[PDB]
Symmetry: D2
Subunit: 257 residues, 4 copies
């Protein structure tokens, strides 16, 4: 397959509906060797099973709020892999009130700080910590959403954090590019994941995308997974600093009128 | 003039080269009544003189790192003005290392936090605190830079923060818009201000814009000031959620080849 | 006013609902001297009355399909004005079928040709013909619509032509910029004009913008007019190659969900 | 491979440096069956050899200036293939003067017409003619350049045509999407092809991209080819109406300062 030999670390594989699961499944199909992170000792068994499904026993704890855990992740990974070819950042968080209702009602300094710390900062932070072991042709991928580009109801503080995240893709691409490393994002359409059980204006958004997207259907984690596998692969060696929409074309229309 | 009767609070007027000074001068010319903020007791005399130049004695301290000072600013302003028609956010900061050299070398969690706190969060934070006294036709303006949209050498962490800031313009526009309040940014070209004495890759950027911009010249604080006055005025009542480039058209070209 | 002394030629003033009428009214208020074009001998009396309303008797025929008429327009204007400070291009056309229903059903080579000839080519063609008499600080303005940027139902072939038009703003800005001339567009929201009595999916779009735009209201020709006057004026001397949205912020949201 | 069974028609394969050749080579590797167009009887032998290199004897004449040839192309193809799964539009032309020097000097109505007819109109025209035989999961791909988005010296009239072309990608995506057909573009970086021997400001642009792109290298037809194969494949079933940059990240920076 087109990822034969590539060794890829995936964050954010929480359930079999996680975007990271679709990415994991596609990467495994195309021949990659995988390793996985988790947060909280209670998910250790679950992530261990997922890893074994993908022929892997490489699982490591990493709460990205913690500098020591970020450093320890790569120290641990390095005892198995002398080099890293891929990194999937599929991590996000904002306090409930900061992604519900009116943008200002949910705005506080702490809510802003946490959302940007976990959803934006953590991507280049992982990149920096991984750098000494990145292969020259490594590829780093993060996940964003159209709320970074345009105001979408309820997305609120997460829209700000995703905008910073997309900017980080561009600055990372420049920092790491002379070495040969690529950095991209996928702007994925709505998919019913665990994170989506935050606000269900989600049902409304899901219906709207199905009705108004050019393909008249919502995307799947298989479709996002395949796009992800592509970006992580040498097939995409000409592509960096890109935010690729995998959203049935929804971003490109004015819908609903 | 086209701002007759409008009462406008300006942050960030540090010296007579400040972008806020150009905005202040243009607003005053067009008939606005002005008030000003400052940071640190040592600038109290200087900002007091600027205010008097613009026919004003309304000066208030406000370090935007401090919730109590943000709240106290509007409590103080309210003892003079029962309503606020305009707000100019012309504030930014990142630690020196976070806007010099390689993006990852200057990246730390604290540097990221501070840059986003001061340069991005503070805009909607001031908006929220001002809201109870905003007039229905009020207009809020912030200042951004092309580094939000594309990777520019040295801008680094500030590029991420400005991207979040531009997103905040869109979410603020939605939150405040049903009331009638407008929220916009100007993406200004390089201008030799006190903030510009950070990294002088500035001389290089300044030369490059002069050589490659469509108008073959750098912008002035008078030009940014006039665009600002326009946005704060009822002339711009159809315009909100916009990031307007005032940069001699530089953003629209691929230059230097 | 801020256009005192400026001499501005306006195309496209067809009725008192025309966007050009709002622009004309705003320019006249701010002190400009106006001249006007028309198409077809039957509109000569009507445009003559409009011109007199704005203190002008300067009216000239110009079908932009015709090279000879474009050249003759400026020869005629030059017998009155030795220089031209402003040009408003507020002209568009596509055959009915090319802006109704399915994009491919209405697509023919001739429909494509006509739409691009009249709606896109004519802007830089007028600029080129005007160039020998343009003042160094002249300002050229055209009108576009969000359908250039994103696919909007029914807009179809006009979306392609407006995309080419917006590109022409950028290339014109470079060509004319070293002289000092500025070139911009306003991307206006829907306004019930004569052109809007093409397809009334217009009623639907109008309702959708009112319901979903940040300001929760449609724009007016007064609002587009004032933005236009600003762009044509020295207030906007820092602004070129820009496509400014005057659409109540509608472009910046994902609405309707 | 990931295009096994897919039947793909490629236009624009002129020499072994053509972007279409890289696309052809990648599609063939991934298992596609190919057919090819050519213009002018003198290239019949050359295109016949290329086709045989890719295991094909399916070659057809098609000058896209001619409606009858467009219709005859698909009538001919249909005698071999009852369905079409992919279409690569890798065609462009503007008269020499319209892509050299100053934008207005090279601007004429005929130059504008020809550039838009051949470089923009021809894409949806081929789509419309192919439609009756397109498979439900078909994928249509065109090639664009950054000059559509920003003004690049010399690109001039072709910048306008590529902007219209990118808009056509969005309108085509909507028209064909309910059926299930996808439509995308690749915005490729400079590559030394036969078309590039127009103006050699090309050497300058090539050097500039190598020096300033994040990956510090120019793209290859292999890299554009692989991205193309991806877009034409079911791996990209979630992706439509997209303009994907394959340009070493050059679009995402401000370079050269
Ligand atoms: N589901 C969608 O509709 C959608 C659309 C566009 C983008 N995205 C993005 O895709 C990414 C994945 O989300 P998802 O949809 O797969 O939902 P998910 O719940 O399956 O994945 C979210 C992950 O974030 C991880 N996470 C949260 N806080 C963390 C921390 N402090 N340290 C480490 N990990 C942490 C969680 O463990 C979880 O694995 C997110 O960035 C999300 O923003 C999702
Ligand atoms: N000068 C340029 O080239 C340029 C270009 C584009 C955008 N901008 C932006 O314009 C805005 C104004 O900068 P400037 O160029 O006028 O330089 P400046 O130094 O004159 O203004 C910066 C202001 O930020 C204020 N500030 C910093 N920390 C603060 C805090 N904690 N609380 C309150 N105020 C604080 C300073 O007091 C100062 O008044 C900034 O947002 C800047 O990012 C500047
Ligand atoms: N009305 C809207 O909702 C809206 C929104 C965005 C942009 N626009 C654009 O604003 C501009 C003005 O349109 P409008 O809304 O004021 O409607 P309008 O009917 O009042 O103006 C259209 C003008 O195009 C002129 N025109 C058509 N063919 C011509 C030719 N061959 N030569 C010279 N002039 C010709 C007509 O004479 C008419 O004056 C157009 O470019 C339009 O695309 C309109
Ligand atoms: N080479 C680059 O740097 C570059 C960069 C970005 C985009 N592009 C685009 O990629 C596409 C392919 O160009 P290329 O670089 O492979 O150069 P090329 O010369 O190899 O391909 C151009 C093709 O256009 C075809 N063509 C011209 N007129 C035609 C007509 N009337 N009917 C049918 N075909 C016609 C030619 O036959 C030729 O095959 C073009 O659209 C071009 O604009 C090229
Ligand atoms: C807000 C209306 C539409 C949002 C749907 C798309 C979407 C985007 C996401 O970034 C997403 O993941 C998160 C959302 C909020 C907080 C944390 C995460 C991981 C989940 C999700 F369903
Ligand atoms: C990094 C190369 C080009 C940057 C020049 C434009 C510019 C943009 C700015 O946002 C600016 O103001 C700051 C920059 C860094 C940190 C804080 C501020 C206020 C100053 C400034 F000169
Ligand atoms: C297609 C749905 C929304 C379109 C509304 C906005 C609009 C945009 C326009 O560019 C416009 O003017 C024309 C439209 C088609 C053909 C010719 C013109 C001048 C009129 C008009 F009402
Ligand atoms: C104008 C300066 C940079 C242009 C380089 C990239 C490029 C873009 C193209 O679209 C291209 O193909 C054509 C260019 C002009 C006319 C016709 C074609 C096919 C060739 C080409 F080298």
């Amino acid at each position: 397959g087109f990822l034969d030999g590539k060794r890829i670390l995936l964050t954010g594989l929480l359930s079999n509906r996680s975007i990271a699961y679709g990415i994991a499944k596609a990467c495994k199909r195309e021949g990659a060797e995988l390793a996985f992170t988790y947060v909280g000792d209670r998910f250790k068994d679950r992530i261990t099973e997922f890893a074994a499904e993908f022929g892997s026993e490489l699982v490591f704890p990493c709460d990205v709020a913690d500098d020591a855990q970020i450093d320890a992740l790569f120290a641990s990974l390095k005892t198995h892999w002398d080099s890293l070819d891929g990194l999937v950042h599929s991590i996000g968080f904002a306090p409930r009130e900061a992604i519900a209702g009116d943008f200002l009602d949910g705005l506080t300094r702490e809510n802003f700080r946490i959302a940007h710390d976990i959803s934006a900062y953590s991507f280049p932070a992982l990149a920096k910590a991984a750098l000494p072991m990145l292969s020259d042709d490594a590829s780093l991928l993060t996940l964003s959403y159209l709320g970074a580009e345009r105001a979408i109801p309820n997305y609120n503080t997460m829209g700000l954090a995703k905008a910073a995240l997309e900017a980080s893709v561009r600055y990372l691409a420049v920092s790491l590019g002379a070495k040969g490393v690529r950095v991209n994002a996928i702007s994925a359409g709505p998919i019913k994941t665990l994170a989506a059980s935050g606000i269900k204006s989600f049902g409304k958004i899901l219906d709207f995308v199905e009705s108004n997207s050019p393909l008249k259907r919502n995307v799947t984690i298989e479709q996002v997974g395949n796009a992800g596998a592509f970006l992580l692969s040498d097939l995409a060696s000409g592509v960096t600093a890109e935010v690729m929409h995998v959203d049935s074309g929804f971003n490109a229309v004015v819908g609903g009128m």
